[PDB]
Coordinates of C-alpha atoms and ligand atoms in Angstrom, one line a residue:
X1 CA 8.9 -8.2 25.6
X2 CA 7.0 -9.0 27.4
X3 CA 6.3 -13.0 27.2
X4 CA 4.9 -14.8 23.8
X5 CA 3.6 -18.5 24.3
X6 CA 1.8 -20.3 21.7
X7 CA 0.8 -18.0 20.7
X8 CA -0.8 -15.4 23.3
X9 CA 1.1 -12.8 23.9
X10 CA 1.8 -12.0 28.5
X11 CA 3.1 -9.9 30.4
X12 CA 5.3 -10.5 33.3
X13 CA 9.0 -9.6 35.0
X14 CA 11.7 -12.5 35.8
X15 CA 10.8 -12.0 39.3
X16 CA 7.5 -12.9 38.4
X17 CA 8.4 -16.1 36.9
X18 CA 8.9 -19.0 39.4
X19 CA 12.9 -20.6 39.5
X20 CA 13.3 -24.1 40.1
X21 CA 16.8 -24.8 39.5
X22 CA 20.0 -24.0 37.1
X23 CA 21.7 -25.8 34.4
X24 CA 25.0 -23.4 33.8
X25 CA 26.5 -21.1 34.2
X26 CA 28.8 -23.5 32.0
X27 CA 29.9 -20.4 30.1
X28 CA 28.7 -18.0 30.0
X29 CA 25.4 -16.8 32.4
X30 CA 23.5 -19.0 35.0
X31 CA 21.2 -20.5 32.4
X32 CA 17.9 -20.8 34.3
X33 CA 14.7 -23.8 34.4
X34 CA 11.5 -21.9 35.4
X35 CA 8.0 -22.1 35.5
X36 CA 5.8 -19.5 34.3
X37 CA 3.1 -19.2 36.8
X38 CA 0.0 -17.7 34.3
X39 CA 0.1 -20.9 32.0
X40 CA 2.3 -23.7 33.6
X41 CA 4.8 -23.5 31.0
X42 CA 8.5 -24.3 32.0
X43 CA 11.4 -22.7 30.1
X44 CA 14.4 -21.9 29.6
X45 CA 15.9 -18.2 31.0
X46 CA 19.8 -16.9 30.3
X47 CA 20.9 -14.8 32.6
X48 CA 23.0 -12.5 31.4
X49 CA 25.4 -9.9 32.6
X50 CA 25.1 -6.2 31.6
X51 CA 26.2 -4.4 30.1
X52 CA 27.2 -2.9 26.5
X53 CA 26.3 0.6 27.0
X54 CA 23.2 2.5 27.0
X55 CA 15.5 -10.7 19.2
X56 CA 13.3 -13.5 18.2
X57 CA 10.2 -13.5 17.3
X58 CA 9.8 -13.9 14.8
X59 CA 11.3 -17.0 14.2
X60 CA 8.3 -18.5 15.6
X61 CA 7.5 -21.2 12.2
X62 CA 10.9 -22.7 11.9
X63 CA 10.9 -25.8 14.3
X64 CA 14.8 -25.9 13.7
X65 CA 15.6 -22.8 15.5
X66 CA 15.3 -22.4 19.6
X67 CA 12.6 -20.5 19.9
X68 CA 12.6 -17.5 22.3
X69 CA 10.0 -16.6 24.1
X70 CA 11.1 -13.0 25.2
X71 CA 13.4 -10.5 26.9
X72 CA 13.4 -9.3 29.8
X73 CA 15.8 -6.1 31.5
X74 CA 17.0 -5.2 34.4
X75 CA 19.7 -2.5 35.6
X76 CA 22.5 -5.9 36.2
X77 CA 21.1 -8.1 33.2
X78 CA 19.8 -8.7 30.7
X79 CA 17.4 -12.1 31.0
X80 CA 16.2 -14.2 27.7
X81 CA 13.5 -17.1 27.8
X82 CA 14.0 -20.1 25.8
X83 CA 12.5 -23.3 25.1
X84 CA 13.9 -25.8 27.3
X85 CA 16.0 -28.3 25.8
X86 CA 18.3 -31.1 26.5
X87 CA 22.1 -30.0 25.7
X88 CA 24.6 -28.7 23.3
X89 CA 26.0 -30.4 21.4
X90 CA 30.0 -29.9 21.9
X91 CA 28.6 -30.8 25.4
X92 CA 27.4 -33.8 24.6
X93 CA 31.2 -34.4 23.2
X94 CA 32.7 -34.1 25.9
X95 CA 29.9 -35.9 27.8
X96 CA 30.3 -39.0 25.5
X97 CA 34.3 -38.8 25.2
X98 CA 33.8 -40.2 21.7
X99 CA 32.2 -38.6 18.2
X100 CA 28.7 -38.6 17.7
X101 CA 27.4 -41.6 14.7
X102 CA 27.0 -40.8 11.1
X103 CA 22.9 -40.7 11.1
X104 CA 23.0 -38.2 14.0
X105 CA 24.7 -35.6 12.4
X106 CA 22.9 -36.4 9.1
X107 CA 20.1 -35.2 11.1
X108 CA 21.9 -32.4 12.3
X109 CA 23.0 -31.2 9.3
X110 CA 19.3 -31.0 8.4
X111 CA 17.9 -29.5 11.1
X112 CA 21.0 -27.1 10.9
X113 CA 21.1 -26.4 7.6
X114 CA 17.5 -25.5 7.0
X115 CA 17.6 -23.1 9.9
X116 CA 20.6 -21.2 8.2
X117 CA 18.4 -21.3 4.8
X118 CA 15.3 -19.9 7.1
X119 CA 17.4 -17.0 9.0
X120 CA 18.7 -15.7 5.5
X121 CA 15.6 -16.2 3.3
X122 CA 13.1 -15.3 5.7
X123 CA 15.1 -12.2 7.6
X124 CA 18.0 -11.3 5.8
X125 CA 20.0 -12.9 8.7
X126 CA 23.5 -14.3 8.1
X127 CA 24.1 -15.4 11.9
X128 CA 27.6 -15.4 12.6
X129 CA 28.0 -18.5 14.7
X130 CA 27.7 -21.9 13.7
X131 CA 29.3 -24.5 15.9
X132 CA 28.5 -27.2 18.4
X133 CA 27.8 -25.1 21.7
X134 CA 24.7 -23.4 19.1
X135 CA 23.2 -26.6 18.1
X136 CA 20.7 -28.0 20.9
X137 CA 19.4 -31.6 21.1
X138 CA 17.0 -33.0 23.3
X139 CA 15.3 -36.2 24.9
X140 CA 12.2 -36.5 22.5
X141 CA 14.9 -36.6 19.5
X142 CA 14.4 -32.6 18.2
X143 CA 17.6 -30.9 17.2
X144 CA 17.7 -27.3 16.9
X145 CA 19.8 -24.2 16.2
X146 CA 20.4 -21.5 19.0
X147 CA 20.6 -18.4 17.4
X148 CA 23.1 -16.7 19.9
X149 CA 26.6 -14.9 19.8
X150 CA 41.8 -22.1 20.1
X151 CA 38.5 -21.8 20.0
X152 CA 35.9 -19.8 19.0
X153 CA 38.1 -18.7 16.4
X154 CA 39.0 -21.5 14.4
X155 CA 35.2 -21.9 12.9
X156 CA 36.4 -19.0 11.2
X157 CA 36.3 -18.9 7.1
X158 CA 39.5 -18.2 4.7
X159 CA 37.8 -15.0 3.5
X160 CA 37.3 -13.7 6.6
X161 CA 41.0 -12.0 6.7
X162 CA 41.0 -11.6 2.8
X163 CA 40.6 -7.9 0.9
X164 CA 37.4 -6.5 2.3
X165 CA 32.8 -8.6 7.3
X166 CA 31.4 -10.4 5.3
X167 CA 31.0 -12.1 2.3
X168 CA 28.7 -14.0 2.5
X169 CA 27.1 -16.7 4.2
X170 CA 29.7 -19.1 2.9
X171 CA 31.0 -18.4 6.2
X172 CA 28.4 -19.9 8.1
X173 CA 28.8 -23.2 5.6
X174 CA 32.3 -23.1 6.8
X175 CA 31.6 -23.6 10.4
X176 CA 28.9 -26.3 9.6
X177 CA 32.0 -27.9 8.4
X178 CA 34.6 -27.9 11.2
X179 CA 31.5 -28.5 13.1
X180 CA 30.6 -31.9 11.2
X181 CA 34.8 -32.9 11.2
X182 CA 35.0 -31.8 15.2
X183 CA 31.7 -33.5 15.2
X184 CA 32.1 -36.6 13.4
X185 CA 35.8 -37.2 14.9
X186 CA 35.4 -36.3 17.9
X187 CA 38.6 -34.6 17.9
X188 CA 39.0 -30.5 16.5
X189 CA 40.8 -30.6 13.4
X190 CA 43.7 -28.9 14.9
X191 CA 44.8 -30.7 17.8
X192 CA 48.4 -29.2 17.5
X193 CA 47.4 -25.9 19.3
X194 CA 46.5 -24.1 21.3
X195 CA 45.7 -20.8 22.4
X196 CA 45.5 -19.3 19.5
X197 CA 46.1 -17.9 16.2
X198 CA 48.6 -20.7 15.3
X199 CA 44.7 -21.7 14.5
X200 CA 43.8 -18.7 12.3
X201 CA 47.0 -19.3 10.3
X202 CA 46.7 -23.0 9.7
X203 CA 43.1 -22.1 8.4
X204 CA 44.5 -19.5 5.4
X205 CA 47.6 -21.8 5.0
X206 CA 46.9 -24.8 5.0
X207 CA 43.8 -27.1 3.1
X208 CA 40.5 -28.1 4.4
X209 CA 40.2 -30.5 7.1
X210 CA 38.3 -32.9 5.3
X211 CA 36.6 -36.1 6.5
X212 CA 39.5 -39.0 7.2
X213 CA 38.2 -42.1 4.6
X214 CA 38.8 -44.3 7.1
X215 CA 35.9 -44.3 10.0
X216 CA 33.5 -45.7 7.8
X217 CA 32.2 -42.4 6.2
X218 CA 29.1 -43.0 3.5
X219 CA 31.1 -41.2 0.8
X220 CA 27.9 -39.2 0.4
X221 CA 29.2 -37.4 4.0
X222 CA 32.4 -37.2 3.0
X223 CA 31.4 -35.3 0.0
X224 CA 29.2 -32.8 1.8
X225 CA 31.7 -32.1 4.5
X226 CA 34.1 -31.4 1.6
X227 CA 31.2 -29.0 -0.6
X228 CA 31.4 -26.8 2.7
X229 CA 35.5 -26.9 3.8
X230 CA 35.5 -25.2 0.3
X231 CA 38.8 -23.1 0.7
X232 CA 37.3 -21.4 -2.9
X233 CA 34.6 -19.7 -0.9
X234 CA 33.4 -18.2 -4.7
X235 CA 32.2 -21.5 -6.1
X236 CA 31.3 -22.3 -2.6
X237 CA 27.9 -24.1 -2.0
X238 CA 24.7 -21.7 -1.0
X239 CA 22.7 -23.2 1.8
X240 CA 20.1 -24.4 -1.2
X241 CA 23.0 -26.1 -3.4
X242 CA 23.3 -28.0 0.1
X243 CA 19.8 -28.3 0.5
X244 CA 19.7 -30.5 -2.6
X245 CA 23.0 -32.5 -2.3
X246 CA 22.6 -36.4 -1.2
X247 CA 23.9 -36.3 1.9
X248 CA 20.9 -34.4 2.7
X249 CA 18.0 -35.8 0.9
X250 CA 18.9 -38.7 2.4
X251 CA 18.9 -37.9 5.7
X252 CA 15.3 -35.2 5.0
X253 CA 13.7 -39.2 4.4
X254 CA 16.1 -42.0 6.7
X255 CA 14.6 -42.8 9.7
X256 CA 16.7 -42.6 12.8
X257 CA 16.2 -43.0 16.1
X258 CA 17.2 -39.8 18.1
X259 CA 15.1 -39.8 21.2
X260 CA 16.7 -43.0 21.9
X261 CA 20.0 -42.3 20.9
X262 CA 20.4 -39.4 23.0
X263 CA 18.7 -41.1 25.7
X264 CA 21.2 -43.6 26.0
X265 CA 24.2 -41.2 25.6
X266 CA 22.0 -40.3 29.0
X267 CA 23.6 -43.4 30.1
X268 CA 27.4 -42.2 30.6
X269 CA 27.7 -39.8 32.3
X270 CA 24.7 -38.4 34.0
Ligands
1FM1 C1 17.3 -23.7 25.4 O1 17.6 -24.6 26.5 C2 18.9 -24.8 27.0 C3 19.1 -25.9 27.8 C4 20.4 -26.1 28.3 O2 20.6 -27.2 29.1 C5 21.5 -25.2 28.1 C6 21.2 -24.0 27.2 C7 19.9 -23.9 26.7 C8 22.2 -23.0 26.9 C9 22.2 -22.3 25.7 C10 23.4 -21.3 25.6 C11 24.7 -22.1 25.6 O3 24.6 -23.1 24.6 C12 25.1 -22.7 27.0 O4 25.3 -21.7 27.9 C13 26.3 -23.6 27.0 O5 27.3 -23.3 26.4 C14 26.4 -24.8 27.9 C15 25.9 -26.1 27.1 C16 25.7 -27.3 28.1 C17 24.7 -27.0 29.3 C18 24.9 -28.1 30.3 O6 23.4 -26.9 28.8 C19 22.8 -25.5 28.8 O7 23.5 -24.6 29.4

């Protein structure tokens, strides 16, 4: 807008806001920590890079989601305010040199999946791009979804280059996937490129990815991370056949220790 914060509505302009320091800038605008000087708050702001020629709210009840605060023109960008969070997770990766455990991305496939389920039952949104650099973590443990828009690429689905975007949101399930596999691994599926298409082909050719037996995998992962990397995109699990598989409802009640997890990955590197 304008500037929404729990839950009054202000106005201001990014100059008003006060800037005390960046965080990247690591693709693709100088991603911004500032303080807005009416209420104290401190927040994230994307600077971004006009222009196409000539968002959210209302997302506002999900807690899965990033939640945006406002937007925010000028004649060179283009700036959106976030809640300020941690890190990405194909960030964090890297960051560790090493996949991320099990319970963590049980957690993340909840947070994830019931953001997807919120976007598409609650706004008719089928949000394009699920994968690691969209999902958000944080020191206090919260793990969130950034709704935003080889590489980039290989997330893609089979029936995305079939007879005739899109159909449907089986796509998005897809790149929950890859993500989980990249994720769980700690390695992208396809480590025989790159860059690219030798990716998009693989992906139509050959069969899903799915999770190695052999890392210790509770079978009830395994078997999730299969019900997405569905090549069959037809009998293809909806978000709420997901919703109601194990791996899940497990994870909606196990207790894990995020905050401190994440914390400690704080430890190496810094
Ligand atoms: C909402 O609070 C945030 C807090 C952050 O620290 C980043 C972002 C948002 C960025 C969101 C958009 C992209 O995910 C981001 O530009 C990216 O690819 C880099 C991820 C690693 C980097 C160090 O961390 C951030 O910058």
């Amino acid at each position: 807008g304008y500037l929404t914060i729990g839950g009054q509505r202000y106005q201001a302009e990014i100059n008003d806001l006060e800037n005390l320091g960046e965080m990247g800038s690591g693709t693709c605008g100088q991603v911004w920590k500032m303080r807005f000087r009416k209420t104290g708050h401190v927040i994230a702001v994307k600077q971004m890079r006009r222009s196409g020629n000539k968002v959210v709210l209302k997302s506002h009840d999900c807690p899965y989601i990033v939640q945006c605060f406002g937007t925010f023109i000028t004649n060179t960008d283009v700036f959106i305010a976030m809640e300020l969070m941690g890190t990405c997770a194909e960030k964090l990766k890297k960051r560790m040199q090493g996949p991320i455990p099990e319970r963590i991305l049980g957690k993340m496939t909840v947070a994830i999946v019931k953001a997807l389920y919120y976007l598409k039952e609650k706004h008719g949104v089928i949000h394009r791009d699920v994968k690691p650099s969209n999902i958000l973590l944080d020191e206090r443990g919260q793990i969130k979804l950034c709704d935003f828009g080889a590489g980039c690429a290989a997330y893609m689905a089979p029936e995305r280059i079939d007879p005739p975007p899109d159909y449907d949101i089986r796509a998005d399930v897809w790149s929950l996937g890859i993500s989980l596999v990249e994720l769980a691994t700690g390695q992208f599926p396809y480590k025989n490129c790159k860059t690219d298409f030798e990716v998009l082909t693989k992906v139509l050719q050959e069969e899903p990815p799915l999770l190695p037996g052999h890392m210790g995998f509770s079978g009830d992962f395994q078997s999730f991370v299969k019900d997405c990397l569905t090549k069959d995109h037809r009998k293809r699990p909806k978000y709420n056949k997901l919703l109601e598989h194990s791996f899940i409802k497990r994870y909606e009640t196990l207790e894990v220790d995020v905050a401190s997890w994440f914390k400690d990955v704080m430890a190496k590197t810094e």
